[PDB]
Symmetry: C3
Subunit: 272 residues, 3 copies
């Protein structure tokens, strides 16, 4: 695999949240999607532009303790500081003991681990999280990828009942990365669509016995993903996605997957 390099900056946002960006002044919440193929190495030249200590910690991928992003492993970044974090990945294969070593591929995420507390409770609450996809050779690639983060009671830190909404055309392969943070369990639900509860969100064939679900319980720092064919068997329309914990949806943990016809039109709907 490739040796890759990116720049990342942690920035306080003008509304007082915090976010990672590929350029100065271009921070988003969630942070930018990082995509790698198993075997790729990624060196992230990270700069903490804030006036508090901040770090970068990744789930699932291979890193040494010097890229833990923790105070425990002396690998957080002082205010205005820089640090190069290195993520590695490996393909699956047979160990000499006969057992099978699981590859890095999966739907993963990165987050701050020092803002607020030694577990990143404040950086997480403020926005310092983002998605990482590690692909296996042969994995099917999508038309679009959309990241949905249930961070305490907000989606992608948006106010109640304020999306995000994602648009697609009927028939598109659409990938969703679904990450959870904070204090609460949630249940992720999409109307109109369903996926397999396995690595890729898709059944490998008729012999794959994976649960096919449209609703999935998640807790802080869980991540999974899937791909659907937009509107498959169900048509164009505004397909809600939402936490299914009753008060959480009532409180605004709801967005719309807007699946349009190939003429760009959608059946009329009446949003909040």
């Amino acid at each position: 695999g490739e040796v890759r390099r990116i720049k990342l900056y942690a920035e306080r946002l003008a509304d007082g949240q915090m976010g990672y960006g590929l350029e100065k002044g271009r921070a988003t919440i969630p942070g930018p999607l990082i995509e790698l193929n198993e075997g790729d190495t990624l060196h992230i030249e990270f700069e903490n532009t804030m006036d508090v200590r901040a770090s970068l910690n990744v789930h699932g991928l291979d890193y040494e303790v010097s890229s833990d992003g923790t105070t425990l492993n002396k690998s957080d970044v002082e205010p205005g500081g820089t640090r190069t974090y290195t993520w590695r990945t490996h393909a699956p294969g047979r160990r000499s003991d006969g057992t099978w070593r699981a590859g890095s591929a999966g739907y993963w995420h990165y987050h701050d681990h020092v803002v607020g507390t030694e577990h990143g409770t404040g950086g997480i609450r403020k926005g310092l999280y983002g998605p990482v996809i590690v692909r296996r050779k042969g994995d099917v690639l999508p038309d679009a990828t959309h990241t949905i983060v249930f961070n305490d009671m907000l989606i992608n830190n948006r106010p109640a009942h304020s999306g995000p909404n994602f648009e697609a055309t009927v028939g598109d392969r659409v990938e969703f990365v679904m990450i959870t943070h904070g204090e609460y369990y949630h249940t992720f639900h999409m109307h109109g669509h369903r996926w397999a509860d396995n690595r890729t969100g898709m059944l490998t064939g008729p012999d794959d016995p994976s649960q096919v679900v449209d609703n999935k319980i998640v807790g802080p720092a869980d991540s999974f993903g899937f791909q659907v064919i937009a509107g498959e068997g169900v048509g164009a329309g505004a397909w809600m996605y939402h936490c299914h914990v009753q008060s959480h949806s009532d409180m605004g943990m709801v967005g719309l997957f807007l699946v349009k016809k190939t003429d760009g039109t959608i059946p009329g709907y009446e949003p909040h």
Copy 2:
């Protein structure tokens, strides 16, 4: 598959509850079990007999936004009104991009989406939910199917400490459909029995790596199901199922799977004293 048609009614029930039924005055909580084979279409002629808008939304099955049963899609039903919902299903198959399209088969459920709030919070609380099983060709069919709904701190909206209990005889192939609703997470456990955490609850063969469990965390709107051979390897008796969150079980989220010997009896079952 085949085109099927049923009538369904939503009605108020005593004590502030609401339910679906196949005929007026026969609503139940949970609502009627709907069972389809992959490829079947079901048209439900739904009548809302209540004085507030109500709907039917289903998980897992195929439906267009005109049968979403949501305010968003203007597909709920006014007081006294009727609407025909359509649920479709499909078998799995290979797509022209080379991927495998997952079939409709599974343990699913339907519920109201507009009573109380535009997420049906009031209607689900009150009893407007029921089970839907879609079978795949070749699926093994059970001797009996029992539905267990954890709705907040109640089972099937029954008073705390009131079951339900289900009976079977050793060797029967008993299916359970387990649905959760409301605000709380739970952990569903059964004494003496275990199942696979996969589509059918049964391992497919020696090649199926699915987890074998007797305890499963669930949250609002999760549904799963399984079949067990009653008493297999463990014999007759009163086998508890309960939520394993400790205060939940202590507050009464418990029921009995009552497994009889083939002679009719349940060991240890002594409801009555004896002289002497």
Copy 3:
């Protein structure tokens, strides 16, 4: 499989705690690891040394109602009493009707069912729980097995911020059994290591579609386990494991997997 016999005791410990042990005065929380192979039968001669009734209930394994360990099935133990519980286990196989019967193998656990309430709420809170592993023929055996119990907001009933920590050398095959109890859901997370969300925690080979995770939601009475190669592709170090529920990790539900180089050293850490 073989017939095995053991003794087990329930005792009070300090601080109003209660524990199971394989010898008097040797109760521990979690209780002793019990390991069987599918087919084995285990007869446990259990003595309740305490002054309240107590019992032994197990998840996963085959038992008759006489060993349910509940008041419902008249199988708890009077103060100072003794009872022999029997656990059986079976291999997987095909039924006469061609359906596949799942085996007893997995990562399971035993606990009291009558202390405090008829669901063992106080017995669990106070420490009456432990791990059982049932192995399948051909399963790989580890170098060490560590048990991590999330019991409400404590790990293994230990005070906040007091581990437990577990040590290995780079390359050791280390097995974890993770059991949760009480009132709360948690998410179990381990730095620098991952596992398959299936029975063994290891993929069966190139066809097994199980998700590979490093973070897993669990609730009361859930149990799972896995093996890793310590430090694989990431090296020696102080690798945290913790609940990832943010207040729970802030309140001290954290431990270290201390993975040492072969010369016994470990990159300097800041606990």
